[PDB]
Amino acid sequence: APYPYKVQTTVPELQYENFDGAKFGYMFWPVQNGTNEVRGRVLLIHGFGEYTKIQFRLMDHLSLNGYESFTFDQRGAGVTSPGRSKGVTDEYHVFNDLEHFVEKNLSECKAKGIPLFMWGHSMGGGICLNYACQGKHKNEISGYIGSGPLIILHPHTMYNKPTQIIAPLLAKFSPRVRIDTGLDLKGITSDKAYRAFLGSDPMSVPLYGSFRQIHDFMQRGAKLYKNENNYIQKNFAKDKPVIIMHGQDDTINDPKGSEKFIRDCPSADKELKLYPGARHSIFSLETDKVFNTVFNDMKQWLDKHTTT
């Protein structure tokens, strides 16, 4: 089944970079709108099961609207960790790998005098928001964007897929054990055409996650949700703007989590945007109606925090 989206710009080459025992597959997407003007660059942290092509639809649109994109297949994901390596990563690497690419992009963006923004979906959303609190360069990112971030699972997901609860609890005893709980296609998107692509994609199925990886990204969001001793108010990078987009019909990641995060956030420039009729993957696998609504909101938000 074909990938429903027709890219309007030139797809970048999938480059590779060795770092800390892994060969990272990454992509730099240049602005292609006929002007030599770049308003800024967005670094895209994908979620569990995802990889570069999933973010093609978003990167294509950023390029047309004056924004460069950088994304990489994380450790445990995509071309970076195939075979037995799939699902194999942890809290340490997740951020240590992210620092490497943040620094790479901060330098290049420093060179051309453009702001760097950080974007994350689901698992990537959990990472993105957590970086705003713990990142080495959290004060050098110009703005944080979350796309239905994994803070707390929706009750529906926990009830129908109890595996994602149990397996983290067992991670300490056997962290290398990998497991495949399959795709919740109907929860992921309301668009049948992207569903078919996803359920047919060799790069999407099978998707294994180890107990260590899963425990770590589950603990990651639960940490933000718990906000023990006002962790978020204390550590969120001062005066950094933050916006979360969350599909209102998201029954994979509870929208109530983004709601509480925005509430807890001490920054002035903060907003939660909920989208009716829209489910989990609003930036990649949803309908054209949803994506356009959802992307315009991101496009405008980025314009407000960029100059010329």
* Radius of gyration of the CA atoms of the chain, in A: 18
Active site residues: 122, 250, 280
What CATH number has the domain bearing residue 280? 3.40.50.1820
Tokens found for residue 253 = 């990641």
The CA distances from residue 196 to 1, 54, 157, in Å, are 6, 14, 21
Domain region containing 290: 1-308
* Resolution to 1 decimal place, in Å: 2.5
CB within 8 Å of 99: residues ≥ 6 apart: 135, 136, 137
User: Which is nearest to 122 in space by CA: 188, 202, 192?
Assistant: 188
Method used to obtain the model:
X-ray
What residues pair up with 70 in beta bridges, in sequence order?
Answer: 28, 43
What total of structural domains would you count in the chain? 1
Cis peptide leading into 206, omega within 30 of 0?
A: yes
End-to-end CA distance of the chain: 41
Give the torsion sign (CA, 153, 26, 287, 87). Answer: negative
Q: Which is it for strands 15-19 and 22-29: parallel, antiparallel or unpaired?
A: antiparallel
User: Which is nearest to 73 in space by CA: 96, 92, 45?
Assistant: 45
Q: Which is it for strands 116-121 and 143-147: parallel, antiparallel or unpaired?
A: parallel
- DSSP 3-state assignment of 145? strand
Q: Report how far residue 119's alpha carbon sits from residue 125's, in angstroms, rounded to the nearest whole number.
A: 7
- DSSP 3-state assignment of 214? helix
